[PDB]
Amino acid sequence: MCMYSATFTLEAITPVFMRGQSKAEIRAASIKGLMRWWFRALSGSYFGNDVEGLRRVEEYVFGSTKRESRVVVEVVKEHVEERFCPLPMVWKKKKGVTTRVSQRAIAPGSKFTLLLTSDDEEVLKLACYSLIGLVYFGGIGFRCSRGAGSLKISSLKSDVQLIDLPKNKNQLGQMVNDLTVEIAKILKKTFLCDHENKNCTSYSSFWCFYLFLWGEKAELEEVYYRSNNLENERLTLLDLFEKEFKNKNNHLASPIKVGITELSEKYHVRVSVFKTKIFKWDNIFVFLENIGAERIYPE
């Protein structure tokens, strides 16, 4: 039983916040839970509405109350610096002028190294793809869906082949199809039936995934929220996105998850969208359309 392993060196682009031992830190179990969620959403591209087989694989990989986990997650390394940084869209009020709430957080540019490991190669591959999906399409920590906790893969090593990290919008669109085709290629060995599963309606999955990019800002300093008032025109990229978001352009986990991606040293505001069924939908789409955001995926 060889112990296959892979290491990821993730670096924050935006501050990571604790949920509310409140000291800032990267807990491996939480990241494993996000990996579980993203594995669910990614495997939804294969299983579709078949939540039972998805349950069997998710239990086989991440474990359960009964089944033991086939994969172990650990923070073997870290370089973290605490700093007080503003919350994504929270706002304290004061006389004359409002002020956004600063809070204790892991500073951007801080990094940490996860050691994925498993006795099964395929399980390590699935966990790796889940972590990659969490890194590119999601984030970590409190208020993660509002652009906090954005991450990038500064470095990667693995005992198994993975999977090409995108350098541009087009490759970023390709990576979704690559992740889905690889996870499906792994799942086909484990299951007899084909990926097809009626109409696209599975909740929170890549079966109904959408991805958007918005804006551009060459420097990291002008990306994250900064200004204490939106009235000034000196707003950062996230401040501008927050301003257009507050504006009545709407014509109205979380279905939408905004974040910051870095492509060839050029930051952008990504927007992940997970369309569902029973919950109730075009308003997010018309909002993204009116703001001029580009929909890189689906191509």
PDB file of C-alpha atoms in Angstrom:
ATOM      1  CA  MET A   1       0.000   0.000   0.000  1.00  0.00           C
ATOM      2  CA  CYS A   2       2.153   2.846  -1.323  1.00  0.00           C
ATOM      3  CA  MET A   3       1.426   6.275   0.147  1.00  0.00           C
ATOM      4  CA  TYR A   4       0.870   8.553  -2.852  1.00  0.00           C
ATOM      5  CA  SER A   5       1.147  12.266  -2.088  1.00  0.00           C
ATOM      6  CA  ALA A   6       0.859  15.773  -3.513  1.00  0.00           C
ATOM      7  CA  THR A   7       1.790  19.207  -2.183  1.00  0.00           C
ATOM      8  CA  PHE A   8       0.162  22.554  -2.940  1.00  0.00           C
ATOM      9  CA  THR A   9       1.583  25.938  -1.986  1.00  0.00           C
ATOM     10  CA  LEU A  10      -1.371  28.317  -1.907  1.00  0.00           C
ATOM     11  CA  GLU A  11      -0.937  32.078  -1.556  1.00  0.00           C
ATOM     12  CA  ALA A  12      -3.669  34.518  -0.550  1.00  0.00           C
ATOM     13  CA  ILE A  13      -4.590  37.258  -3.015  1.00  0.00           C
ATOM     14  CA  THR A  14      -7.191  38.600  -0.597  1.00  0.00           C
ATOM     15  CA  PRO A  15      -7.281  38.406   3.225  1.00  0.00           C
ATOM     16  CA  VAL A  16      -8.600  35.243   4.883  1.00  0.00           C
ATOM     17  CA  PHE A  17     -11.056  35.787   7.740  1.00  0.00           C
ATOM     18  CA  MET A  18     -11.885  33.539  10.695  1.00  0.00           C
ATOM     19  CA  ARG A  19     -15.492  32.370  11.075  1.00  0.00           C
ATOM     20  CA  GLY A  20     -15.850  34.661  14.163  1.00  0.00           C
ATOM     21  CA  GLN A  21      -9.229  30.060  19.547  1.00  0.00           C
ATOM     22  CA  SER A  22     -10.331  32.863  17.218  1.00  0.00           C
ATOM     23  CA  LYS A  23      -6.731  33.639  16.233  1.00  0.00           C
ATOM     24  CA  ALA A  24      -6.096  33.609  12.481  1.00  0.00           C
ATOM     25  CA  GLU A  25      -4.813  30.301  11.104  1.00  0.00           C
ATOM     26  CA  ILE A  26      -5.348  27.715   8.369  1.00  0.00           C
ATOM     27  CA  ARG A  27      -7.191  24.697   9.767  1.00  0.00           C
ATOM     28  CA  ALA A  28      -6.794  21.627   7.557  1.00  0.00           C
ATOM     29  CA  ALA A  29     -10.210  20.160   8.394  1.00  0.00           C
ATOM     30  CA  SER A  30     -12.031  23.250   7.141  1.00  0.00           C
ATOM     31  CA  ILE A  31     -10.120  23.174   3.870  1.00  0.00           C
ATOM     32  CA  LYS A  32     -10.992  19.485   3.644  1.00  0.00           C
ATOM     33  CA  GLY A  33     -14.652  20.395   4.029  1.00  0.00           C
ATOM     34  CA  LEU A  34     -14.408  22.949   1.242  1.00  0.00           C
ATOM     35  CA  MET A  35     -12.672  20.259  -0.805  1.00  0.00           C
ATOM     36  CA  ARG A  36     -15.620  17.986  -0.083  1.00  0.00           C
ATOM     37  CA  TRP A  37     -18.086  20.630  -1.251  1.00  0.00           C
ATOM     38  CA  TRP A  38     -16.130  21.403  -4.409  1.00  0.00           C
ATOM     39  CA  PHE A  39     -15.725  17.698  -5.111  1.00  0.00           C
ATOM     40  CA  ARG A  40     -19.502  17.475  -4.898  1.00  0.00           C
ATOM     41  CA  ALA A  41     -20.044  20.384  -7.283  1.00  0.00           C
ATOM     42  CA  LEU A  42     -17.388  19.061  -9.678  1.00  0.00           C
ATOM     43  CA  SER A  43     -18.602  15.459  -9.605  1.00  0.00           C
ATOM     44  CA  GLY A  44     -22.074  16.817 -10.275  1.00  0.00           C
ATOM     45  CA  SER A  45     -20.846  17.251 -13.842  1.00  0.00           C
ATOM     46  CA  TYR A  46     -20.771  13.450 -13.986  1.00  0.00           C
ATOM     47  CA  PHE A  47     -23.420  12.118 -11.593  1.00  0.00           C
ATOM     48  CA  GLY A  48     -26.010  14.781 -12.395  1.00  0.00           C
ATOM     49  CA  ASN A  49     -29.145  14.072 -10.366  1.00  0.00           C
ATOM     50  CA  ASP A  50     -27.724  10.721  -9.241  1.00  0.00           C
ATOM     51  CA  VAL A  51     -26.888  11.832  -5.704  1.00  0.00           C
ATOM     52  CA  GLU A  52     -26.526   8.245  -4.466  1.00  0.00           C
ATOM     53  CA  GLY A  53     -23.431   7.360  -6.478  1.00  0.00           C
ATOM     54  CA  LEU A  54     -22.113  10.808  -5.661  1.00  0.00           C
ATOM     55  CA  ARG A  55     -22.725   9.937  -2.019  1.00  0.00           C
ATOM     56  CA  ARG A  56     -20.808   6.691  -2.435  1.00  0.00           C
ATOM     57  CA  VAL A  57     -17.782   8.372  -3.994  1.00  0.00           C
ATOM     58  CA  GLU A  58     -17.803  11.367  -1.649  1.00  0.00           C
ATOM     59  CA  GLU A  59     -17.945   8.952   1.280  1.00  0.00           C
ATOM     60  CA  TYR A  60     -15.245   6.758  -0.239  1.00  0.00           C
ATOM     61  CA  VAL A  61     -12.934   9.761  -0.566  1.00  0.00           C
ATOM     62  CA  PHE A  62     -13.654  12.195   2.268  1.00  0.00           C
ATOM     63  CA  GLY A  63     -14.950   9.561   4.679  1.00  0.00           C
ATOM     64  CA  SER A  64     -18.115   9.527   6.768  1.00  0.00           C
ATOM     65  CA  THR A  65     -19.543   8.620  10.169  1.00  0.00           C
ATOM     66  CA  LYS A  66     -19.046   5.033   9.012  1.00  0.00           C
ATOM     67  CA  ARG A  67     -16.484   4.957   6.195  1.00  0.00           C
ATOM     68  CA  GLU A  68     -12.953   6.161   6.954  1.00  0.00           C
ATOM     69  CA  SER A  69     -11.427   8.829   4.700  1.00  0.00           C
ATOM     70  CA  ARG A  70      -9.145   7.491   1.963  1.00  0.00           C
ATOM     71  CA  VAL A  71      -7.376  10.855   1.763  1.00  0.00           C
ATOM     72  CA  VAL A  72      -5.549  12.863   4.434  1.00  0.00           C
ATOM     73  CA  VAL A  73      -5.122  16.646   4.460  1.00  0.00           C
ATOM     74  CA  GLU A  74      -2.468  18.493   6.467  1.00  0.00           C
ATOM     75  CA  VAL A  75      -0.848  21.927   6.651  1.00  0.00           C
ATOM     76  CA  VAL A  76       2.781  20.769   6.634  1.00  0.00           C
ATOM     77  CA  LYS A  77       4.087  24.304   6.047  1.00  0.00           C
ATOM     78  CA  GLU A  78       3.044  27.943   6.413  1.00  0.00           C
ATOM     79  CA  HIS A  79       4.201  31.552   6.164  1.00  0.00           C
ATOM     80  CA  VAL A  80       1.379  33.621   7.629  1.00  0.00           C
ATOM     81  CA  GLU A  81       1.326  37.276   8.659  1.00  0.00           C
ATOM     82  CA  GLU A  82      -1.599  38.644  10.665  1.00  0.00           C
ATOM     83  CA  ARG A  83      -3.020  42.021   9.634  1.00  0.00           C
ATOM     84  CA  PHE A  84      -6.245  43.933  10.201  1.00  0.00           C
ATOM     85  CA  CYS A  85      -8.118  44.144   6.904  1.00  0.00           C
ATOM     86  CA  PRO A  86     -11.637  45.344   6.011  1.00  0.00           C
ATOM     87  CA  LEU A  87     -14.509  42.874   5.717  1.00  0.00           C
ATOM     88  CA  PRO A  88     -15.784  42.434   2.120  1.00  0.00           C
ATOM     89  CA  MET A  89     -19.104  44.319   2.282  1.00  0.00           C
ATOM     90  CA  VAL A  90     -19.776  44.961   5.984  1.00  0.00           C
ATOM     91  CA  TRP A  91     -20.214  48.601   7.069  1.00  0.00           C
ATOM     92  CA  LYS A  92     -20.065  50.225  10.506  1.00  0.00           C
ATOM     93  CA  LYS A  93     -21.838  53.571  10.853  1.00  0.00           C
ATOM     94  CA  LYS A  94     -20.373  56.761  12.328  1.00  0.00           C
ATOM     95  CA  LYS A  95     -21.334  60.433  12.592  1.00  0.00           C
ATOM     96  CA  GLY A  96     -21.129  62.290   9.288  1.00  0.00           C
ATOM     97  CA  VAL A  97     -19.511  59.407   7.418  1.00  0.00           C
ATOM     98  CA  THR A  98     -19.775  55.598   7.400  1.00  0.00           C
ATOM     99  CA  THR A  99     -16.735  53.352   7.887  1.00  0.00           C
ATOM    100  CA  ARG A 100     -16.185  49.773   6.687  1.00  0.00           C
ATOM    101  CA  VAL A 101     -15.395  47.190   9.365  1.00  0.00           C
ATOM    102  CA  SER A 102     -11.765  46.138   9.680  1.00  0.00           C
ATOM    103  CA  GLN A 103     -11.065  42.760  11.291  1.00  0.00           C
ATOM    104  CA  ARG A 104      -8.188  40.435  12.193  1.00  0.00           C
ATOM    105  CA  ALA A 105      -7.160  38.397   9.152  1.00  0.00           C
ATOM    106  CA  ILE A 106      -4.420  36.525   7.325  1.00  0.00           C
ATOM    107  CA  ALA A 107      -2.703  39.100   5.106  1.00  0.00           C
ATOM    108  CA  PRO A 108      -2.511  38.759   1.320  1.00  0.00           C
ATOM    109  CA  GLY A 109       0.847  37.380   0.203  1.00  0.00           C
ATOM    110  CA  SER A 110       0.787  34.989   3.139  1.00  0.00           C
ATOM    111  CA  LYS A 111       0.990  31.360   2.081  1.00  0.00           C
ATOM    112  CA  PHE A 112       0.547  27.778   3.247  1.00  0.00           C
ATOM    113  CA  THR A 113       1.341  24.271   2.020  1.00  0.00           C
ATOM    114  CA  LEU A 114      -1.223  21.468   1.948  1.00  0.00           C
ATOM    115  CA  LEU A 115      -0.100  17.839   1.819  1.00  0.00           C
ATOM    116  CA  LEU A 116      -2.761  15.696   0.178  1.00  0.00           C
ATOM    117  CA  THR A 117      -2.084  11.968   0.572  1.00  0.00           C
ATOM    118  CA  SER A 118      -3.777   8.634  -0.140  1.00  0.00           C
ATOM    119  CA  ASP A 119      -3.070   4.938  -0.688  1.00  0.00           C
ATOM    120  CA  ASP A 120      -5.095   5.223  -3.899  1.00  0.00           C
ATOM    121  CA  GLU A 121      -3.834   7.203  -6.901  1.00  0.00           C
ATOM    122  CA  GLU A 122      -7.317   7.981  -8.197  1.00  0.00           C
ATOM    123  CA  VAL A 123      -8.420   9.310  -4.811  1.00  0.00           C
ATOM    124  CA  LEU A 124      -5.413  11.616  -4.705  1.00  0.00           C
ATOM    125  CA  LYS A 125      -6.303  12.791  -8.202  1.00  0.00           C
ATOM    126  CA  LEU A 126      -9.903  13.508  -7.214  1.00  0.00           C
ATOM    127  CA  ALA A 127      -8.841  15.393  -4.093  1.00  0.00           C
ATOM    128  CA  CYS A 128      -6.333  17.338  -6.185  1.00  0.00           C
ATOM    129  CA  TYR A 129      -8.960  18.323  -8.741  1.00  0.00           C
ATOM    130  CA  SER A 130     -11.254  19.319  -5.887  1.00  0.00           C
ATOM    131  CA  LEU A 131      -8.561  21.543  -4.395  1.00  0.00           C
ATOM    132  CA  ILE A 132      -7.897  23.076  -7.815  1.00  0.00           C
ATOM    133  CA  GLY A 133     -11.586  23.815  -8.257  1.00  0.00           C
ATOM    134  CA  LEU A 134     -11.690  25.351  -4.792  1.00  0.00           C
ATOM    135  CA  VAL A 135      -8.668  27.508  -5.617  1.00  0.00           C
ATOM    136  CA  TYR A 136      -9.755  28.771  -9.024  1.00  0.00           C
ATOM    137  CA  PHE A 137     -13.532  28.970  -8.617  1.00  0.00           C
ATOM    138  CA  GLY A 138     -13.841  29.620  -4.881  1.00  0.00           C
ATOM    139  CA  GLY A 139     -12.005  30.703  -1.744  1.00  0.00           C
ATOM    140  CA  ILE A 140     -11.628  30.119   1.998  1.00  0.00           C
ATOM    141  CA  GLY A 141     -12.601  31.695   5.315  1.00  0.00           C
ATOM    142  CA  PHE A 142     -15.437  33.956   6.442  1.00  0.00           C
ATOM    143  CA  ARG A 143     -17.340  35.897   3.772  1.00  0.00           C
ATOM    144  CA  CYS A 144     -15.531  33.834   1.139  1.00  0.00           C
ATOM    145  CA  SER A 145     -18.340  34.259  -1.399  1.00  0.00           C
ATOM    146  CA  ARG A 146     -17.888  38.032  -1.298  1.00  0.00           C
ATOM    147  CA  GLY A 147     -14.316  37.952  -2.607  1.00  0.00           C
ATOM    148  CA  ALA A 148     -12.424  37.411   0.639  1.00  0.00           C
ATOM    149  CA  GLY A 149     -10.065  34.448   0.878  1.00  0.00           C
ATOM    150  CA  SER A 150      -9.113  34.315  -2.802  1.00  0.00           C
ATOM    151  CA  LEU A 151      -6.084  32.108  -3.450  1.00  0.00           C
ATOM    152  CA  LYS A 152      -3.553  31.168  -6.117  1.00  0.00           C
ATOM    153  CA  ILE A 153      -1.275  28.162  -6.628  1.00  0.00           C
ATOM    154  CA  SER A 154       2.246  29.560  -6.230  1.00  0.00           C
ATOM    155  CA  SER A 155       3.691  26.041  -6.423  1.00  0.00           C
ATOM    156  CA  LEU A 156       2.618  22.429  -6.945  1.00  0.00           C
ATOM    157  CA  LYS A 157       4.117  18.937  -6.744  1.00  0.00           C
ATOM    158  CA  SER A 158       2.382  15.577  -7.138  1.00  0.00           C
ATOM    159  CA  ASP A 159       3.023  11.835  -7.384  1.00  0.00           C
ATOM    160  CA  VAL A 160       0.256  11.711  -9.989  1.00  0.00           C
ATOM    161  CA  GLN A 161      -0.184  13.649 -13.229  1.00  0.00           C
ATOM    162  CA  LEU A 162      -2.726  16.469 -13.078  1.00  0.00           C
ATOM    163  CA  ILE A 163      -4.559  18.788 -15.469  1.00  0.00           C
ATOM    164  CA  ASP A 164      -2.173  22.611 -16.960  1.00  0.00           C
ATOM    165  CA  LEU A 165      -2.905  25.716 -14.893  1.00  0.00           C
ATOM    166  CA  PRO A 166      -4.364  28.514 -17.087  1.00  0.00           C
ATOM    167  CA  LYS A 167      -2.359  31.612 -18.030  1.00  0.00           C
ATOM    168  CA  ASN A 168      -5.290  33.441 -19.633  1.00  0.00           C
ATOM    169  CA  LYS A 169      -9.062  33.766 -19.961  1.00  0.00           C
ATOM    170  CA  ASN A 170      -9.279  31.147 -22.707  1.00  0.00           C
ATOM    171  CA  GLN A 171      -7.230  28.566 -20.825  1.00  0.00           C
ATOM    172  CA  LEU A 172      -9.268  29.432 -17.733  1.00  0.00           C
ATOM    173  CA  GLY A 173     -12.339  28.425 -19.700  1.00  0.00           C
ATOM    174  CA  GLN A 174     -10.574  25.275 -20.865  1.00  0.00           C
ATOM    175  CA  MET A 175      -9.655  24.243 -17.313  1.00  0.00           C
ATOM    176  CA  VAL A 176     -13.297  23.678 -16.372  1.00  0.00           C
ATOM    177  CA  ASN A 177     -13.730  21.213 -19.222  1.00  0.00           C
ATOM    178  CA  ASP A 178     -10.393  19.629 -18.332  1.00  0.00           C
ATOM    179  CA  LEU A 179     -11.375  19.142 -14.695  1.00  0.00           C
ATOM    180  CA  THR A 180     -14.751  17.720 -15.658  1.00  0.00           C
ATOM    181  CA  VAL A 181     -13.308  15.414 -18.322  1.00  0.00           C
ATOM    182  CA  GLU A 182     -10.631  14.151 -15.926  1.00  0.00           C
ATOM    183  CA  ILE A 183     -12.983  13.594 -12.999  1.00  0.00           C
ATOM    184  CA  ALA A 184     -15.366  11.864 -15.401  1.00  0.00           C
ATOM    185  CA  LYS A 185     -12.492   9.787 -16.775  1.00  0.00           C
ATOM    186  CA  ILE A 186     -11.730   8.640 -13.232  1.00  0.00           C
ATOM    187  CA  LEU A 187     -15.385   8.035 -12.360  1.00  0.00           C
ATOM    188  CA  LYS A 188     -16.000   5.928 -15.480  1.00  0.00           C
ATOM    189  CA  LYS A 189     -13.675   3.251 -14.106  1.00  0.00           C
ATOM    190  CA  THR A 190     -15.630   3.270 -10.841  1.00  0.00           C
ATOM    191  CA  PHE A 191     -19.096   3.249 -12.430  1.00  0.00           C
ATOM    192  CA  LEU A 192     -20.918   1.423 -15.222  1.00  0.00           C
ATOM    193  CA  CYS A 193     -23.418   4.087 -16.315  1.00  0.00           C
ATOM    194  CA  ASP A 194     -22.690   7.098 -18.537  1.00  0.00           C
ATOM    195  CA  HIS A 195     -22.521  10.710 -17.322  1.00  0.00           C
ATOM    196  CA  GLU A 196     -25.971  11.515 -18.738  1.00  0.00           C
ATOM    197  CA  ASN A 197     -28.707  12.144 -16.165  1.00  0.00           C
ATOM    198  CA  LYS A 198     -31.789  13.858 -17.628  1.00  0.00           C
ATOM    199  CA  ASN A 199     -32.111  17.648 -17.853  1.00  0.00           C
ATOM    200  CA  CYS A 200     -29.566  19.982 -16.254  1.00  0.00           C
ATOM    201  CA  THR A 201     -31.058  20.779 -12.850  1.00  0.00           C
ATOM    202  CA  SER A 202     -28.764  19.412 -10.125  1.00  0.00           C
ATOM    203  CA  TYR A 203     -28.200  21.901  -7.296  1.00  0.00           C
ATOM    204  CA  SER A 204     -24.781  23.513  -6.731  1.00  0.00           C
ATOM    205  CA  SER A 205     -22.791  21.662  -9.392  1.00  0.00           C
ATOM    206  CA  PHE A 206     -20.686  21.979 -12.539  1.00  0.00           C
ATOM    207  CA  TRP A 207     -23.607  20.329 -14.309  1.00  0.00           C
ATOM    208  CA  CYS A 208     -24.999  23.878 -14.312  1.00  0.00           C
ATOM    209  CA  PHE A 209     -21.836  25.904 -13.648  1.00  0.00           C
ATOM    210  CA  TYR A 210     -21.233  29.381 -15.046  1.00  0.00           C
ATOM    211  CA  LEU A 211     -18.129  31.553 -14.793  1.00  0.00           C
ATOM    212  CA  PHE A 212     -17.648  35.278 -15.315  1.00  0.00           C
ATOM    213  CA  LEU A 213     -14.764  37.746 -15.372  1.00  0.00           C
ATOM    214  CA  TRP A 214     -15.055  41.461 -14.674  1.00  0.00           C
ATOM    215  CA  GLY A 215     -12.623  44.367 -14.667  1.00  0.00           C
ATOM    216  CA  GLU A 216      -8.835  44.507 -14.661  1.00  0.00           C
ATOM    217  CA  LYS A 217      -6.208  45.989 -12.340  1.00  0.00           C
ATOM    218  CA  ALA A 218      -2.462  45.544 -12.842  1.00  0.00           C
ATOM    219  CA  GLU A 219      -1.523  45.969  -9.172  1.00  0.00           C
ATOM    220  CA  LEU A 220      -2.758  43.943  -6.190  1.00  0.00           C
ATOM    221  CA  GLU A 221      -2.929  47.047  -3.985  1.00  0.00           C
ATOM    222  CA  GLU A 222      -5.759  48.538  -6.049  1.00  0.00           C
ATOM    223  CA  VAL A 223      -7.801  45.321  -6.158  1.00  0.00           C
ATOM    224  CA  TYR A 224      -9.110  44.673  -2.629  1.00  0.00           C
ATOM    225  CA  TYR A 225     -11.609  46.895  -0.785  1.00  0.00           C
ATOM    226  CA  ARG A 226      -9.982  50.002   0.686  1.00  0.00           C
ATOM    227  CA  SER A 227     -11.935  53.277   0.634  1.00  0.00           C
ATOM    228  CA  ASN A 228     -14.144  54.061   3.635  1.00  0.00           C
ATOM    229  CA  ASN A 229     -16.727  55.705   1.378  1.00  0.00           C
ATOM    230  CA  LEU A 230     -17.972  54.889  -2.117  1.00  0.00           C
ATOM    231  CA  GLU A 231     -18.559  58.585  -2.826  1.00  0.00           C
ATOM    232  CA  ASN A 232     -14.936  59.127  -3.879  1.00  0.00           C
ATOM    233  CA  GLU A 233     -13.793  58.201  -7.392  1.00  0.00           C
ATOM    234  CA  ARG A 234     -10.539  56.710  -6.065  1.00  0.00           C
ATOM    235  CA  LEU A 235     -12.288  53.370  -5.505  1.00  0.00           C
ATOM    236  CA  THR A 236     -10.436  50.066  -5.835  1.00  0.00           C
ATOM    237  CA  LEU A 237     -11.637  47.338  -8.210  1.00  0.00           C
ATOM    238  CA  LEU A 238     -13.577  45.528  -5.479  1.00  0.00           C
ATOM    239  CA  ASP A 239     -14.928  48.863  -4.244  1.00  0.00           C
ATOM    240  CA  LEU A 240     -16.201  49.613  -7.741  1.00  0.00           C
ATOM    241  CA  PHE A 241     -17.749  46.160  -8.000  1.00  0.00           C
ATOM    242  CA  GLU A 242     -19.388  46.740  -4.625  1.00  0.00           C
ATOM    243  CA  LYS A 243     -20.671  50.086  -5.873  1.00  0.00           C
ATOM    244  CA  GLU A 244     -22.203  48.663  -9.040  1.00  0.00           C
ATOM    245  CA  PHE A 245     -23.568  45.821  -6.906  1.00  0.00           C
ATOM    246  CA  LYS A 246     -25.252  48.242  -4.493  1.00  0.00           C
ATOM    247  CA  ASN A 247     -26.719  50.099  -7.471  1.00  0.00           C
ATOM    248  CA  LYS A 248     -30.192  49.059  -8.631  1.00  0.00           C
ATOM    249  CA  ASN A 249     -28.882  47.262 -11.713  1.00  0.00           C
ATOM    250  CA  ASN A 250     -30.274  43.965 -10.393  1.00  0.00           C
ATOM    251  CA  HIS A 251     -33.857  44.634 -11.501  1.00  0.00           C
ATOM    252  CA  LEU A 252     -34.931  42.494  -8.538  1.00  0.00           C
ATOM    253  CA  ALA A 253     -23.885  27.296  -0.372  1.00  0.00           C
ATOM    254  CA  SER A 254     -24.615  30.674  -1.966  1.00  0.00           C
ATOM    255  CA  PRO A 255     -25.564  30.500  -5.678  1.00  0.00           C
ATOM    256  CA  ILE A 256     -22.958  33.146  -6.518  1.00  0.00           C
ATOM    257  CA  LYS A 257     -19.326  33.327  -5.411  1.00  0.00           C
ATOM    258  CA  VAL A 258     -17.244  36.338  -6.432  1.00  0.00           C
ATOM    259  CA  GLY A 259     -13.462  36.325  -6.048  1.00  0.00           C
ATOM    260  CA  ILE A 260     -10.178  37.510  -7.534  1.00  0.00           C
ATOM    261  CA  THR A 261      -8.286  35.506 -10.147  1.00  0.00           C
ATOM    262  CA  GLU A 262      -4.752  36.274 -11.317  1.00  0.00           C
ATOM    263  CA  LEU A 263      -3.927  35.653 -14.975  1.00  0.00           C
ATOM    264  CA  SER A 264      -0.385  36.499 -16.112  1.00  0.00           C
ATOM    265  CA  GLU A 265       0.085  39.056 -13.316  1.00  0.00           C
ATOM    266  CA  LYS A 266      -3.259  40.685 -14.120  1.00  0.00           C
ATOM    267  CA  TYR A 267      -6.028  40.556 -11.513  1.00  0.00           C
ATOM    268  CA  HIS A 268      -9.716  40.136 -12.387  1.00  0.00           C
ATOM    269  CA  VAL A 269     -13.021  39.805 -10.530  1.00  0.00           C
ATOM    270  CA  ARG A 270     -14.264  36.261 -11.104  1.00  0.00           C
ATOM    271  CA  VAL A 271     -17.916  35.403 -10.500  1.00  0.00           C
ATOM    272  CA  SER A 272     -18.942  31.773 -10.057  1.00  0.00           C
ATOM    273  CA  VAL A 273     -22.605  30.851 -10.555  1.00  0.00           C
ATOM    274  CA  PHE A 274     -24.285  27.570  -9.611  1.00  0.00           C
ATOM    275  CA  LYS A 275     -27.784  27.363 -11.091  1.00  0.00           C
ATOM    276  CA  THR A 276     -30.186  25.046  -9.253  1.00  0.00           C
ATOM    277  CA  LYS A 277     -33.711  23.644  -9.606  1.00  0.00           C
ATOM    278  CA  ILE A 278     -36.219  23.781  -6.743  1.00  0.00           C
ATOM    279  CA  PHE A 279     -34.690  26.971  -5.339  1.00  0.00           C
ATOM    280  CA  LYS A 280     -35.682  30.229  -7.036  1.00  0.00           C
ATOM    281  CA  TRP A 281     -33.068  33.050 -11.850  1.00  0.00           C
ATOM    282  CA  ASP A 282     -32.130  35.253 -14.807  1.00  0.00           C
ATOM    283  CA  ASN A 283     -31.747  38.295 -12.548  1.00  0.00           C
ATOM    284  CA  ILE A 284     -28.147  37.420 -11.691  1.00  0.00           C
ATOM    285  CA  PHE A 285     -27.553  36.963 -15.407  1.00  0.00           C
ATOM    286  CA  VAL A 286     -29.096  40.281 -16.429  1.00  0.00           C
ATOM    287  CA  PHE A 287     -27.155  41.938 -13.606  1.00  0.00           C
ATOM    288  CA  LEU A 288     -23.912  40.441 -14.903  1.00  0.00           C
ATOM    289  CA  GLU A 289     -24.913  41.501 -18.421  1.00  0.00           C
ATOM    290  CA  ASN A 290     -25.707  45.125 -17.579  1.00  0.00           C
ATOM    291  CA  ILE A 291     -22.363  45.552 -15.800  1.00  0.00           C
ATOM    292  CA  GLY A 292     -20.606  44.257 -18.909  1.00  0.00           C
ATOM    293  CA  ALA A 293     -18.973  41.280 -17.195  1.00  0.00           C
ATOM    294  CA  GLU A 294     -17.571  38.690 -19.613  1.00  0.00           C
ATOM    295  CA  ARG A 295     -18.840  35.099 -19.455  1.00  0.00           C
ATOM    296  CA  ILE A 296     -15.747  33.020 -20.216  1.00  0.00           C
ATOM    297  CA  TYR A 297     -17.552  29.787 -19.371  1.00  0.00           C
ATOM    298  CA  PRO A 298     -19.473  28.128 -20.901  1.00  0.00           C
ATOM    299  CA  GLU A 299     -17.582  29.028 -24.092  1.00  0.00           C
TER     300      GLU A 299
END
